[PDB]
Ligand binder design. Structure first.
Ligand SMILES: CC(C)(COP(=O)(O)OP(=O)(O)OC[C@H]1O[C@@H](n2cnc3c(N)ncnc32)[C@H](O)[C@@H]1OP(=O)(O)O)[C@@H](O)C(=O)NCCC(=O)NCCSCC(=O)O
Ligand SMILES: CC(=O)SCCNC(=O)CCNC(=O)[C@H](O)C(C)(C)COP(=O)(O)OP(=O)(O)OC[C@H]1O[C@@H](n2cnc3c(N)ncnc32)[C@H](O)[C@@H]1OP(=O)(O)O
Ligand SMILES: O=P(O)(O)O[C@H]1[C@H](OP(=O)(O)O)[C@@H](OP(=O)(O)O)[C@H](OP(=O)(O)O)[C@@H](OP(=O)(O)O)[C@H]1OP(=O)(O)O
Lengths: 6, 197, 786, 159
């Protein structure tokens, strides 16, 4: 799971 | 029973719905379109299947793709398209509805994804992030699939949890799906005879 | 200079550009260029209102070519695509030399579905910039979409000739894609013509070494062979596809057809027996025989071989995997699986076989739940839970049984016990949220949901859930507010009749609630169309991006997706449910310290929205036009005739006076579902009652409709009988359509003031029709439908 | 790997450990006790036991640094396995984690208070090398139901 926030 | 197939743009609304149910990291529809329209051969989905038997329109439900078919898992995949490494991919998101876990769905999706990245895109490796406390996901990636830990990313997720950045090197022949047909004489289709022998 | 402000807009110094443009207009406040670019800087700094006023002043004063372009961009940004086209065009016709404008026009023209003109724009851009493959691909796509297929193929082929030996490694993916795309067009144009198909196959063979989409190539190859009647060749390719993905059912059935054994269970048994040896972990070889075996003993043996090993490994979805057999082969398969799984359980010991024990109990719970034996279903899940109370899934199944029993609060509570075991897992959180919404406990639902949202600048997660486009939550909440609304409308009417006095305190309290819930229901439902319009707008970038990226086949699939957005299930759900509010607002118009609550229910940023409780939506003077512009028109322009909801059609047109469209919807419904359907019957009776000379419809319509009903349905209904006050429409209805056709009775009941046929008898008929239904369904009808 | 494994307890699955303690040792733990384990000076160790990935037992132990007689060291505060998963070495594995933590912390004593009436459990700790210390401790165990009962203390020396 990639977090697009950071 | 569950069917595994390649994803199309017709699956992205339900893929987003699955992501929304199963993970705290969420993305706008534009971001799924960016994936499916940039790497249209890389993402896969898992769905129920209602086959005709010898013996309606679609349910108004956010998991449904078609009559008798709803989405229970997906793997959303991209190639790395930042600024000059060799070609490598990223598993943006993988999830499966809880009532469908622990029967090999994630594994099946992942193997199709790794093989596609290699085959379609000549990807040399693939990367992903995973929560340190995610037992199920760690088992899948480290044990089942032999990903490596590349690093620790402190406070990577929004709630502050650390991630592992994980990596796997991809080589075409070892990723072939026929290598994984037997969990444990391994007979194969030679694609030659007549099967009704 | 004004040119200093344009470069200073191109560079993101938006304030910087602004000082400049204010100085210019202090001297000349009627400078068209200056006013226009003011707008676009002001827009890029969120200052939307002012931007709009500066743009519209410049439009009045009207221009320059640079101005035209600025305005083109502003309009694109505010989604006025047709206006953007007007301004980009004016930029050209007023002497711009910027050939990029043709690319921008193609994007905008494509977005609005004007591919005729898009094709003109692709041709001019291609002529100006022949060096970029993207411009060839996009011209070919425009040609194809306009039906110029040979021209499309020629455009692609001409690029290939020029690129022969000049394709770099990084361009090879795009090349592969463009090769397959050409094959697609050749393939469609070949139809069933055997020579053409033969040449399409030759092309596929020729390109195979440069195509990296091997599944796509193999699939096209099989289908070509099939249409060439070379089934054996097809069969080898399908076997090749299965080996690449033995978990894909579709490939197995296509293989059957290529071997000519679709109708031969003997040979099918052998095929899957053989395929099972190659692919032992895969579902299709084990499962497909379960769909055609008829011999009790063979079917039974196969069922056993499929389900027992899953129970043994402890797979949760064992039942769910066989559920489609219980659905299509109920009488045959369920008695057999009941016996198989009960015998398996009796051999198991809870301390030695704990895993099969608990998951076999779980299966049997699911089994008896499916067959509607709820006490037995609870027994079996209880045994699992008591043995291993640490599996969240067991709480889900127990809650689910309680849901079917109508115990919504109890069901939500069990799920909440499960959730507490695993605060990491969003899925159990979401289902717990859903169950609390189903119990109308909105406050608990929102508190639980908010554990997973970015609530950064908000008291809870309502805003986040809107940002991430979470229709699942928003629709369920809309529906929960609507139920609360109807409940409080009841408690409100009971309070009036209990005036026989601070009861006036209790009604002013309830009157607030009725409105608060009515408005929030409608506001939450209106969130959905907003998402789906954004999905349509989201296509904009792709008209150029896909061409650059080299994915033309996927691009055309996006076009088809966009033309179906307003027909997708959650859109149709929000529309259908919202219509309840608009329709009743129409029917009805024919008969403080909120500041605290305001924050807990706000959906959008303060600035974008001040109608937090949806008061403006419920106070509308035009509820029907609002339903049309917000939900129905877009759905209606896109929906296929074979999925169209004619009942919605009927009920919408009935309320805008269009009785002939009501007849058309009724007529088309009957063509599809036939004239024995209670819904057909009830729509007919309601429409007939509308042709009554006393009713508030146009007499010209009552006349034309009376004739269409005579033309079509004279032998289905006693049409002559609307003049006899003694004729028992309700009795006729039950004679023809039976007294158990619940949905048809409920339709009449909805029109009971307009079409009185004995509201009290109708009601009692619905009540005695309920007994065959599950308890939850019985109760929601008694409480929310009647 | 081995069908039984141990892994860490986190705030997110704390409720799993609480459920395990409630079904294996009813009426002893205030939910506050569990909550204090992950709220941000005494050090606790926690651990869950999984059987084929199912949580079926757990452990809460406490480092007791210091005036104190020879009941310094590691105190076992909870150690429990679901009934149907007993007699598969899982309790032994959890106890061994506790004992091992004792030595990591360079301590030499592990101890536990049990209900004086719980003979079966006492015998299990004695089979694992624990010894009773003195005699029954008057009304040491307060229940959640306000009830009370006598405890015994058991101890085990670690090199
Ligand atoms: C992680 C999952 C996708 C696994 O899906 P699945 O279909 O249940 O996996 P699976 O049945 O293929 O099992 C794969 C392996 O993991 C093991 N496994 C599955 N569930 C668990 C569990 N709860 N605890 C420990 N191991 C587990 C399983 O036994 C198998 O191992 P082996 O090959 O040794 O037999 C699922 O748990 C899930 O959707 N979780 C919620 C969403 C999530 O956390 N996603 C991944 C985020 S990380 C990367 C980004 O994205
Ligand atoms: C204050 C507090 O700290 S909490 C109070 C303590 N806990 C309780 O009272 C809770 C209730 N009790 C329990 O949860 C359990 O009975 C426990 C924790 C005491 C023991 O857990 P178990 O997992 O059964 O321990 P384990 O399996 O290691 O040992 C039990 C017996 O099975 C034996 N055993 C070990 N492996 C196997 C095997 N493969 N097959 C058969 N027997 C086995 C052990 O040798 C032991 O035998 P013995 O006592 O006759 O010598
Ligand atoms: O329609 P809902 O009220 O949301 O309930 C659904 C529905 O089950 P029932 O209507 O039979 O209770 C699903 O079955 P389908 O309608 O898709 O056939 C079921 O899915 P599965 O049978 O595939 O599990 C799902 O269960 P879950 O999401 O737990 O897997 C369950 O939802 P709830 O469990 O949330 O009630």
């Amino acid at each position: 799971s990639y977090s697009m926030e950071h | 029973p569950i069917n595994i197939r390649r994803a199309t743009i017709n699956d992205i609304i339900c893929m987003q719905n699955a992501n929304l149910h199963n993970l705290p990291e969420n993305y706008m529809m534009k971001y799924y379109m960016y994936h499916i329209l940039s790497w249209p051969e890389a993402s896969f989905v898992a769905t129920t299947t209602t086959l005709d038997c010898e013996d309606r329109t679609i349910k108004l439900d956010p998991t449904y793709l078609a009559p008798g078919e709803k989405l229970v898992g997906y793997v959303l995949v991209k190639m790395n398209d930042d600024p000059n490494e060799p070609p490598n991919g990223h598993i943006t998101s993988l999830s499966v509805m809880r009532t469908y876990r622990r029967m090999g769905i994630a594994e099946n999706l992942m193997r199709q994804a790794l093989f596609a990245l290699r085959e379609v895109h000549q990807a040399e490796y693939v990367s992903l992030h995973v929560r340190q406390s995610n037992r199920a996901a760690l088992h899948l990636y480290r044990d089942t699939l032999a990903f490596e830990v590349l690093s620790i990313e402190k406070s990577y997720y929004q709630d502050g949890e650390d991630a592992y950045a994980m990596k796997k090197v991809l080589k075409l022949e070892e990723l072939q799906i026929s290598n994984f047909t037997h969990r444990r004489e391994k007979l194969e289709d030679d694609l030659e005879s007549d099967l009704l022998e | 200079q004004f040119l200093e402000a344009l470069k200073l807009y191109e560079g993101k110094q938006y304030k910087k550009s602004l000082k400049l443009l204010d100085a210019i207009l202090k001297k000349d406040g009627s400078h068209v260029d200056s006013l226009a670019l003011k707008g676009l800087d002001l827009y890029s700094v969120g200052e939307k209102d002012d931007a709009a006023s500066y743009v519209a002043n410049a439009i009045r004063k009207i221009a320059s070519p640079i101005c035209c372009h600025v305005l083109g961009i502003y309009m694109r940004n505010t989604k006025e695509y047709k206006e953007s086209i007007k301004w980009f065009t004016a930029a050209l016709n007023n002497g711009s030399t910027n050939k990029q404008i043709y690319r921008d026009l193609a994007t905008l023209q494509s977005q609005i579905g004007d591919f005729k003109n898009a094709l003109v724009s692709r041709k001019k851009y291609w002529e100006a910039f022949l060096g970029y493959r993207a411009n060839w691909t996009s011209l070919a796509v425009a040609q194809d979409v306009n039906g110029e297929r040979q021209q499309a193929i020629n455009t692609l082929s001409q690029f290939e000739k020029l690129a022969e030996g000049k394709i770099s490694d990084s361009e090879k993916y795009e090349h592969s894609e463009c090769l397959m795309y050409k094959n697609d067009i050749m393939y469609k144009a070949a139809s069933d013509n055997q020579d053409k198909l033969q040449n399409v196959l030759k092309h596929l063979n020729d390109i195979e070494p440069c195509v990296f989409d091997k599944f796509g190539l193999l699939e096209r190859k099989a289908t070509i062979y099939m249409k060439l009647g070379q089934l054996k060749d097809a069969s080898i390719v399908y076997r090749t596809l299965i080996k690449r993905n033995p978990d894909n059912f579709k490939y197995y059935k296509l293989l059957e057809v290529s071997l000519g054994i679709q109708g031969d269970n003997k040979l099918k048994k052998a095929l899957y027996g053989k395929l099972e040896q190659f692919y032992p972990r895969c579902e299709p070889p084990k499962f497909i025989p379960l769909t055609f075996l008829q011999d009790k003993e063979e079917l039974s043996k196969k069922l056993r071989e499929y389900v027992l090993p899953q129970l043994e490994r402890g797979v949760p979805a064992t039942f769910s995997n066989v559920k489609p057999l219980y659905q299509r082969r109920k009488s045959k398969v369920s008695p057999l699986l009941e016996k198989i799984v009960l015998d398996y359980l009796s051999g198991l010991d809870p301390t030695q076989d704990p895993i099969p024990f608990i998951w076999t109990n779980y299966y049997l719970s699911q089994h008896f739940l499916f067959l509607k034996d709820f006490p037995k279903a609870q027994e079996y899940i209880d045994a699992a839970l008591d043995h291993t109370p640490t599996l969240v899934e067991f709480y889900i199944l127990k809650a689910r049984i309680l849901k079917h029993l109508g115990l919504m609060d109890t069901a939500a509570g069990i799920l909440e016990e499960g959730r507490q075991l695993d605060l990491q897992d969003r899925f159990i959180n979401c289902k717990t949220v859903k169950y609390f919404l189903r119990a109308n406990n909105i406050d608990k639902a929102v508190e639980v949901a908010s554990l997973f949202t970015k609530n950064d600048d908000s008291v809870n997660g309502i805003k986040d859930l809107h940002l991430v486009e979470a229709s699942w939550f928003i629709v369920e909440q809309a529906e929960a507010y609507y139920r609360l609304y109807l409940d409080r409308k009841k408690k409100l009417d009971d309070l009036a009749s209990l005036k026989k006095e601070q009861i006036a305190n209790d009604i002013k309290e309830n009157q607030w609630l009725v409105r608060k819930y009515k408005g929030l229901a409608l506001k939450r439902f209106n969130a959905i169309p907003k998402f789906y319009k954004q999905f349509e707008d989201d296509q904009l970038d792709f008209h150029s991006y896909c061409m650059r990226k080299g994915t033309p086949r996927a691009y055309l699939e996006m076009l088809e997706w966009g033309k179906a957005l307003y027909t997708k299930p959650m859109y149709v759900r929000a529309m259908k449910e919202a219509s309840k509010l608009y329709f009743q607002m129409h029917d009805d118009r024919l008969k403080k310290r909120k500041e605290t609550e305001a924050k807990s229910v706000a959906a959008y940023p303060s600035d974008q929205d001040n109608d937090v409780f949806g008061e403006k939506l419920i106070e509308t003077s035009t509820p029907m036009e609002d339903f049309a512009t917000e939900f129905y028109n877009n759905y209606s322009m896109q929906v296929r005739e074979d999925e169209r909801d004619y009942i919605l059609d009927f009920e919408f047109n009935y309320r805008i006076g269009k009785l002939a469209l009501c007849f058309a919807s009724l007529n088309k419904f009957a063509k599809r579902f036939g004239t024995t359907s209670g819904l057909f019957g009830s729509m007919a009776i309601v429409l007939l009652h509308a042709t009554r000379n006393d009713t508030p419809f146009d007499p010209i319509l009552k006349k034309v409709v009376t004739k269409s009903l005579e033309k079509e349905y004279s032998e289905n209904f006693p049409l002559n009988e609307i003049s006899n006050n003694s004729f028992d429409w309700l009795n006729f209805y039950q004679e023809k359509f039976g007294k158990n056709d619940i949905n048809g009775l409920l339709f009449l009941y909805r029109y009971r003031d307009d079409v009185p046929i004995g509201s009290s008898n109708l009601k009692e008929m619905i009540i005695s029709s309920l007994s065959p239904l599950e308890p939850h369904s019985q109760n929601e009808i008694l409480q929310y439908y009647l | 790997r081995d069908i039984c494994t141990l892994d860490n307890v986190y705030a997110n699955n704390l409720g799993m450990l609480t459920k395990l303690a409630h079904v294996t040792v009813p009426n002893l733990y205030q939910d506050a006790f569990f909550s204090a384990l992950f709220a941000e000076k005494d050090v606790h160790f926690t651990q869950m036991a999984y059987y084929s990935e199912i949580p079926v037992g757990g452990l809460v132990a406490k480092l007791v640094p210091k005036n104190e007689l020879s009941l310094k060291g590691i105190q076992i505060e909870f150690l429990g396995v679901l009934p149907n998963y007993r007699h598969k070495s899982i309790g032994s594995k959890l106890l061994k984690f506790a004992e091992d933590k004792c030595s990591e912390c360079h301590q030499h004593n592990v101890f536990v208070y049990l209900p004086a009436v719980d003979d079966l459990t006492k015998q299990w700790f004695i089979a694992h090398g624990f010894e009773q210390v003195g005699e029954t401790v008057n009304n040491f165990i307060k229940g959640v139901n306000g009830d009370e009962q006598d405890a015994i203390l058991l101890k085990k020396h670690i090199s």
